[PDB]
């Protein structure tokens, strides 16, 4: 639509705008290693995080 | 004549209000000069 | 009770040739500290004055059961062997550190006449850690 999604090392989840670097929503949870992502999946409107 | 009364007023107002003394002399002090030097910290 | 060895040194070249200078006697049960000393031989007096003429250092050392410290010789021998030891320890009991400081002040240069310095008018005290107070809730209340 306008957007892409990432899932980084710093446990963040972002929803960047694919015309210019800018954020719509972060959902940073936890610096320390009990929120570190291990997989990711997009069902075409939503996401899934483990 | 005038000397006496003038200095009497001076001395009384000093004895209750005026004098230049320690607190007032405080701001005429230059700071000391560090003679010794220490630097270090953790062991990286 | 316990005993503790104590070494001292002073040279022209600021080296380490630590030798014994008497022992400490410490009561664990109740805090008490005591010293047992021997007074200086004359050769040590000469060497010490020759040191003080160069702003050398008087160094002291004891073991952990190491730890050291130092102080200029001038500010000591200008004080007729007036010195002071502090012995800092931990909460549970272990030697932590040692401080040697003279009374009074420092160097002026005036001659001592070199007959005063066989007395060792010294003094010792330990000091454990002071606790720290809570936030005095009474005045907080009213």
């Amino acid at each position: 639509s306008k957007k892409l999604v990432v899932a980084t090392e710093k446990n963040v989840i972002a929803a960047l705008n694919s015309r210019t670097g800018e954020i719509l929503w972060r959902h940073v949870d936890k610096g320390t290693a009990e929120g570190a992502v291990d997989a990711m999946l997009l069902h075409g409107q939503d996401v899934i995080t483990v | 004549n005038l000397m006496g009364l003038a200095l009497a007023v001076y001395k009384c107002q000093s004895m209750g209000l005026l004098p230049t003394h320690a607190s007032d002399w405080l701001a005429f002090i230059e700071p000391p000069e560090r003679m010794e030097f220490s630097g270090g910290g953790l062991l990286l | 009770t316990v005993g503790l060895l104590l070494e001292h040194s002073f040279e022209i070249d600021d080296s380490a040739n630590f030798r014994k200078r008497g022992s400490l006697l410490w009561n664990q049960q109740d805090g008490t500290l005591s010293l047992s000393q021997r007074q200086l031989s004359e050769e040590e007096r000469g060497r010490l004055r020759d040191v003080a003429a160069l702003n050398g250092l008087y160094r002291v050392r004891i073991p952990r059961r190491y730890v050291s410290s130092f102080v200029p010789a001038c500010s000591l021998v200008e004080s007729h062997l007036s010195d002071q030891l502090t012995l800092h320890v931990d909460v549970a009991g272990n030697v932590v550190g040692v401080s040697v400081v003279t009374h009074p002040g420092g160097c002026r240069g005036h001659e001592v006449e070199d007959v005063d310095l066989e007395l060792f008018n010294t003094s010792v005290q330990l000091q454990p850690p002071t606790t720290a107070p809570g936030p005095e809730t009474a005045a907080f209340i009213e």
Partner: protein, 348 residues
């Protein structure tokens, strides 16, 4: 343990022409030594692992300067593993002779951090005017340093936090304090003659602040020089402990040259907001049912439950997420401080 020295020009981003020397051995520590050379450059002494010094701008001029004034230069080193401190000094040639030594048992105390005054500060007033036009002089001791420790036997009846105040030159403890029932990650500031540390009390499950001040007395002892090899008499410590309604992240103090203006404490909360707190609110000399002297001295008795109202938050809606740190730098105007908060996201 290898180490590398990269020199450049911060304006354009370029390596400089002069090539740095090649370090063979693992480095331990370094100091900056504001004495200059004939090109207006500081000297950056580095200490080897075999206790040998290297001086980066190693020209003849600097070497003669050092062969003159070496014995007024002292290093202090610290290893938390076995818990021991050491202090060395220079010689005419560049070597090191162990001068003082000191330990701490690593089974009941574990060093957390070590602080020393910023060299780039200048303080205006050497004394605090008392109520009745008297004076209380304050002990500065540039070469001081604070040490903070915490226990090993972590359990919330027998936990304790330790403080030590040391001189870097001799190795003598000014003060050695213990605060029981407190464990938490600490946060410390050691400024001109005051100290602040924040911790967590397990006996009423609340954060806390503790503050120290050092005052020598009513007179001045060699007011012009302050050689640290000459002070027998140790100062009088004042202290006090308040409570705080929240948690903490990086904490710092303001700064400006000439030290005139009031000093604040910049606090990083967890929610990302910053808080400016006036130091004059944390004063151990607070009336505590005032006399009339304290009344005159306007010392605002013993503020209970030091407060939090959102009228002094810098970052209104500019929250910073993690806030691992803060940097404060001085302007040239002496009424402003420049603030930079760094975490997962910058602020300025």
């Amino acid at each position: 343990g290898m180490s590398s020295l990269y020199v450049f020009n911060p304006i354009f981003g370029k390596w400089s022409q002069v090539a740095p020397p090649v370090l063979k051995r693992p480095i331990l520590q370094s100091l900056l030594l504001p004495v200059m050379d004939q090109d207006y450059a500081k000297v950056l002494l580095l200490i080897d692992d075999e206790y040998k010094v290297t001086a980066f701008p190693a020209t003849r001029n600097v070497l003669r300067q050092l062969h003159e004034l070496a014995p007024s230069i002292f290093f202090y080193l610290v290893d938390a593993e076995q818990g021991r401190l050491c202090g060395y000094r220079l010689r005419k040639d560049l070597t090191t002779e162990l001068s003082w030594e000191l330990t701490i048992p690593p089974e009941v105390q574990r060093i957390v951090k070590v602080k020393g005054k910023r060299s780039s500060e200048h303080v205006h007033s050497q004394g605090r005017v008392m109520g009745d036009r008297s004076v209380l002089y304050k002990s500065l001791n540039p070469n001081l340093l604070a040490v903070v420790t915490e226990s090993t036997d972590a359990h919330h009846e027998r936990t304790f936090i330790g403080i030590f105040l040391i001189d870097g030159v001799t190795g003598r403890i000014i003060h050695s304090s213990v605060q029981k029932k407190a464990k938490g990650p600490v946060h410390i500031v050691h400024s001109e003659n005051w100290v602040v540390y924040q911790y967590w009390n397990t006996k009423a499950r609340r954060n806390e602040f503790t503050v120290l001040e050092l005052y020598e007395g009513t007179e001045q002892y060699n007011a012009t020089a302050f050689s640290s090899l000459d002070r027998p008499q140790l100062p009088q410590v004042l202290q006090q402990s308040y409570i705080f309604p929240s948690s903490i992240s990086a904490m710092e103090a303001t700064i400006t040259e000439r030290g005139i203006t009031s000093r604040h404490l910049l606090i990083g909360l967890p929610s990302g907001a910053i808080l400016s707190l006036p130091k004059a609110l944390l004063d151990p000399r607070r009336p505590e049912i005032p006399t009339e002297q304290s009344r005159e001295e306007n010392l605002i008795p013993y503020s209970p439950d030091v407060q939090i109202h959102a009228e002094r938050f810098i970052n209104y809606n500019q929250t910073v997420s993690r806030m691992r740190g803060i940097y404060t730098a001085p302007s040239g105007l002496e009424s402003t401080c420049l603030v930079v908060a760094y975490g997962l996201d910058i602020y300025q």
